[PDB]
Amino acid sequence: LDPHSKCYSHINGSAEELLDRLAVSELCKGWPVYRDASEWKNYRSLFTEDATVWTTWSGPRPVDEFITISKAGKEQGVFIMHRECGTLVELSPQQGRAIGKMKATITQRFSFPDAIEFDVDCDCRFIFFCEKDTASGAWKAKYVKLFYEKDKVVSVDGHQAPKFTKDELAKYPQGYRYLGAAQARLGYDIDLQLPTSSGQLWDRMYGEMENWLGGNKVDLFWEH
Amino acid sequence: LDPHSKCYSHINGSAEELLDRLAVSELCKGWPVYRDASEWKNYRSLFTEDATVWTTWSGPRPVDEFITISKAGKEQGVFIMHRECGTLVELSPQQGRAIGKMKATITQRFSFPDAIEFDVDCDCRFIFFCEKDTASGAWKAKYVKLFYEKDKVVSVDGHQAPKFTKDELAKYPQGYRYLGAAQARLGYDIDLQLPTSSGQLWDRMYGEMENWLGGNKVDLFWEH
Amino acid sequence: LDPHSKCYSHINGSAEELLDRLAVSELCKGWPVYRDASEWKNYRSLFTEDATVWTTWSGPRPVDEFITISKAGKEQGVFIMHRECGTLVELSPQQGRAIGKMKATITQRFSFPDAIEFDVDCDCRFIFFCEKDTASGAWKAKYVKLFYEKDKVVSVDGHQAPKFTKDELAKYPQGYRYLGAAQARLGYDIDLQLPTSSGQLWDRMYGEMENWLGGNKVDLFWEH
Ligand SMILES: [Ca+2]
Ligand SMILES: [Ca+2]
Ligand SMILES: [Ca+2]
Ligand SMILES: [Ca+2]
Ligand SMILES: [Ca+2]
Ligand SMILES: [Ca+2]
Ligand SMILES: [Ca+2]
Ligand SMILES: [Ca+2]
Ligand SMILES: [Ca+2]
Ligand SMILES: [K+]
């Protein structure tokens, strides 16, 4: 069933619209390129001053707070990388609004006690809620939240892998059960209210996407 | 050995040519972004009215028929996703023709009888045969067919994986033997006449690509 | 810690700057798209006449020499593919200089003596040192060198994988130990002086990147 109620500018169009979608596509790719490399000036430049991001392991965070705890995680040996897997844009020219749709694999490297190294690879879709500064013409992201689609445990040596009990996996939504369970082993409190490939929060996510493209305020804060 | 007989517009060039290649690149990415999310209005918008697509499990299908059977598959629990892996364009400005070259991984999630979950990941290259509406200037894809390069079985828990006999794999071309064999277990009749990294259909595929860029009709229907 | 001393044009900007970053992004993607398909005219067109590239298995090579030994490798059954994973650009408009940052997975298919097939998948970042021809306006890459971030052994059938001793892996920098060790088994002499996610050559790589963007000659030749 098609989750979109309407169509937006997404292919072809005018040169101005093509270059707006190009600009928004670059913002999206800035998360994998800049966060993975700790290029924090570049990473901060993607966002509005009042931006909020959501992850499994942080929940909602204002961007500057997110950067602080990301640095802390990296200092403690946390090793999250991203593989971008296909990026397109929904553009609403008269609202100065856009949604960046960036398919990705979150690929996080863990150890389990020579210790067993493993990745958890989660195929997901980052949704960038972007707006255009009428003065500057510049695009910036105000919100980033993800759909989580499927995940897997990846042996690093091809022989050894960790073990997760059924009960350990059961509290997480299907789509990020291994990623949540592994991050929980590091001590993080995991957000269980993130959208997957089906269900209530999937519908909600598309509703907020269309609200944004219609020019409204959105409500991505789903615990209150 | 270089499979191209000639060079086309593929880097640099005029702003018009850069924006034409950008527009075609977006069409390509629409298959992973829109099909994986069941965004059917968006997916249909990529194609001409008379478009045909080829897959391992469907063979050649008119696009609207392809969408119908894709919906049916998804309703029956079929779970194909795509990871886009590098997209460039060959442009023929005076013919209003272009070829979109999109590297990808088809990543299909299966079960084998707690049941063993596994992916088959097939590295492939989608070829989008695109044309420009002289009135509108809009680019649309008339044909999509793939090169299949290599594949593998991916354990989801890192311990358990299915088993395929040599005979089960033997009828498929090298490049999609695991993908074909696994899809056949679902009941699909698999097209065995799809191009891989070498051989007769590889040459044929490049021949039809250059025919398209030269302005000709192409012959991608390889059973008659 | 942020490895960049300064900011460059990387998002938004003028249409001219957006189209310059687009053009450079295409050059980057030409390595995965054209080298994997042996499209040698296309691949050669990415580079300046005096270009040099660095890989694990070749060390530094002038591009035309690199193409010769790549053809030889492919004739001997070498099977390297690339998955592009996110590409952005740092642009210095007044210097006519740019750095292409292309995240990728090198995915090389090997056999070990029915023989065990396996991939080594190395997440890496290609750095393309690009310059703009003032006459033509065309962008070309003068240098390509990579950061190597992490790697893994990938079973092809989901059951069998090769074994590497600790001593076999120990001489390689963390980030490409499996890739280096496997390529060494083919007979290649492996460059051990390539940058990873931390340390002296990581800092050096960012230093040379900023030198390039400042208009200087760079020194990427790290053995003399
Ligand atoms: Ca604009
Ligand atoms: Ca609404
Ligand atoms: Ca709320
Ligand atoms: Ca155009
Ligand atoms: Ca011909
Ligand atoms: Ca025919
Ligand atoms: Ca230009
Ligand atoms: Ca300097
Ligand atoms: Ca030197
Ligand atoms: K990609």
Numbering used by the authors:
A (entry chain A), B (entry chain A), C (entry chain A): 5 to 117, 133 to 243
Give the original sentences from the paper that presented this experimental model.
AGDC1 and PPP2 fit in none of these categories as both enzymes neither display cofactors bound to their active sites nor require the styrene motif or ATP hydrolysis. Instead, they act on the carboxyl-group directly attached to the aromatic ring. The trimers of AGDC1 and PPP2 in the crystal structures represent the functional biological unit, evidenced by the size exclusion chromatography data and the extensive intermonomer buried surfaces and interactions.
Finally, the AGDC1 homolog from Madurella mycetomatis, PPP2 (GenBank: KXX81388.1, sharing 52% protein sequence identity with AGDC1), crystallized with only one molecule per AU in the space group P321, and its crystal structure was phased by single-wavelength anomalous dispersion (SAD) of the Se-Met derivatized protein. Apo-PPP2 had one molecule in the asymmetric unit (AU) in the space group P321 and was solved at 1.7 Å resolution by SAD. PPP2 has high protein sequence homology to AGDC1, with 63% overall similarity and 51% identity. In contrast, helix α4 of AGDC1 is absent in PPP2, being replaced instead by a shorter segment without a secondary structure. While the potassium ion is also at the center of the PPP2 trimer, no divalent metal-binding sites, equivalent to those of Co2+ in AGDC1, were found in the PPP2 structure, conforming with the enzyme activity being unaffected by Co2+. E88 is conserved in PPP2, and the potassium binding site in PPP2 is identical to that described for AGDC1, but the occupancy of potassium in PPP2 was 19% compared to 100% for AGDC1 after occupancy refinement in Phenix31. The lower potassium occupancy in PPP2 is probably due to the differences in crystallization conditions: 200 mM potassium salt for AGDC1 vs. its absence (200 mM CaCl2 instead) for PPP2 crystals. The cobalt binding site of AGDC1 is missing in PPP2, in which a serine side chain (S52 in PPP2) replaces the crucial E49.
